[PDB]
Amino acid sequence: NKRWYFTREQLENSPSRRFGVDPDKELSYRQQAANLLQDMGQRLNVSQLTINTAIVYMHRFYMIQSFTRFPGNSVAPAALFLAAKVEGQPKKLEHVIKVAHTCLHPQESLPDTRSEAYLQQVQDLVILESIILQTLGFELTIDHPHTHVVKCTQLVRASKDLAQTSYFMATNSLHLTTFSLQYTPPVVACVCIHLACKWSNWEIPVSTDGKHWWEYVDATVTLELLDELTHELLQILEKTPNRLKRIWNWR
């Protein structure tokens, strides 16, 4: 139950670190895998939910395995192959090999579906899917902040706009951070509303009780923490090119 939540001291000392991989570096090995995932998932016309699931799989997978033995470009397609089944949007093994290929080698031509070369990479993926399964120890039912986002936004009568922004934040928290490895969906969700508000100059009228909007969503949540985390998230958002422009008010 605390199995896939780790402390900052555990996150630092990770399977990859113990094979020489710097923190900053490992951290961008994840971001990269997440990109590959989103890239592939859109071409395979699966949902964001399915993509998010795969990303969380990827995240937890590398809290056990190292990037120096399992390359993101190999894990990401297998993780997405899995998430799609698990989420009801099954895509065919040959179909996923295809798309992974063009994503990782936009130039290179596809091998003869009959060759020994191609017959291997199919083998490989399937093997990998098996290792992800065992590595996760068959716990594939994920819970994403997005569910809770709806709830927090009824609790502020928020406009479409502010709602959409919060989801944006949510999705980006997975691509860009390791929150999903540290904080439970509901908490992360509050973080995503907090910063969506900040980013939009949206105001939160204290309840009549002196209660804050969040305490309704997760008891363990303190503003002292909200500020700490929305800072962290915003910081990397700013490091990420073009991403913020997506929600910037051009007017």
């Binding site: 199995r3 399977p15 056990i64 395995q65 033995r69 192959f81 899995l82 089944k85 698990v86 099954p90 065919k92 093994l93 993926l125 399937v126 899917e129 098996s130 290792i131 399964l133 065992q134 590595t135 996760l136 120890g137 068959f138 716990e139 594939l140 039912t141």
Partner: protein, 308 residues
């Protein structure tokens, strides 16, 4: 080289003891260190060209979710050092092998209990948005200490209120509801409650009460025990295409209570079966309303099991 794997134990930590089934390949086994008995279902990677089988994922999804004294219990999942084993608590009996063996005998108190545990087991899973889709005595295990468990969630699937388009090819023929035989793809719980009706009868008869060779044959046995399918009895049956496109008697009257007086004595018990074996799903008794039936609340009261 070897790979790190903290949450999947090699199944070698159990010692196999005996085959027991029958989809798929299922062994009793003993934990090498503690003696704990377990059941292992191997996951069959034969004819599986799409990686790890989606249905296995479904089942494993559902077993991890359903946690309850009347639902079989998935302890863990194991690997070899290649395939994959589901690991359950071991159940000493199953209701089929109890109903065949002729030395085994049931008091009314013992029967009320079995049914009670089974209707509770259903309420639970239905409440959790799951349809079992494989009701049959052979899937109803009992434990040495006398507790009932439901099993084989191999066909189970989740359900919602979205109209739906669920698979029709489900449930062993002898326990399939009418609804299904008429090509229904938007069904729900009442299909599992039909099963329970059949099993409830099978408790006094030692035998499946409607043994058909095919759909045609089956449906006819049903219309023979529960009357004909008319919109006066089951409003809106005509709405189905397979309705007229099929041979069904027209002069049939409900002999549900008549045919069963022989083996079943208790009148409350009869009244209950009759609300379980109801043609129209939307008129067929709830698993809640059934546990609330005077059958469970009259003498003899339901008793524990040591009539083993």
């Amino acid at each position: 080289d070897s790979v790190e794997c903290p949450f999947c134990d090699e199944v070698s930590k159990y010692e196999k003891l005996a085959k027991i089934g029958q989809f798929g390949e299922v062994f009793k086994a003993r934990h090498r260190k503690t003696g704990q008995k377990v059941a292992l279902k191997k996951v069959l990677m034969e004819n599986e060209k799409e990686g790890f089988p989606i249905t296995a994922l479904r089942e494993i999804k559902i077993l991890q979710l359903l946690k309850h004294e009347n639902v079989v219990n998935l302890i863990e999942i194991c690997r070899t050092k290649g395939s994959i084993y589901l690991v359950f608590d071991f159940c000493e009996h199953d209701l089929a092998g109890l109903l065949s063996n002729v030395l085994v005998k049931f008091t009314l108190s013992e029967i009320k209990r079995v049914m009670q545990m089974l209707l509770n087991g259903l309420y639970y899973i239905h409440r959790n948005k799951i349809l079992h889709r494989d009701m049959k005595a052979a899937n109803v295990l009992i434990t040495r200490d006398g507790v009932l468990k439901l099993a084989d969630f191999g066909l189970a699937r989740a359900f919602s209120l979205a109209p739906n388009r669920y698979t029709n090819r489900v449930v062993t023929l002898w326990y399939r509801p009418p609804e299904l035989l008429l090509g229904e793809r938007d069904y729900g719980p009442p299909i599992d409650l039909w099963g329970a009706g059949c099993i409830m009868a099978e408790m006094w008869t030692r035998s499946p009460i409607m043994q058909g060779n095919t759909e045609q044959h089956q449906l006819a046995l049903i219309s023979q025990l529960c009357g004909s399918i008319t919109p006066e009895v089951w409003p809106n049956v005509d709405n189905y295409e397979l309705y007229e496109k099929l041979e069904l008697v027209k002069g049939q009257k409900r002999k549900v209570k008549d045919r069963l007086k022989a083996y079943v004595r208790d009148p409350y018990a009869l009244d209950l079966i009759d609300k379980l074996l109801v043609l129209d799903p939307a008129q067929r008794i709830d698993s809640d309303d059934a546990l609330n039936h005077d059958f469970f609340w009259s003498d003899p009261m339901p008793s524990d099991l040591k009539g083993m």
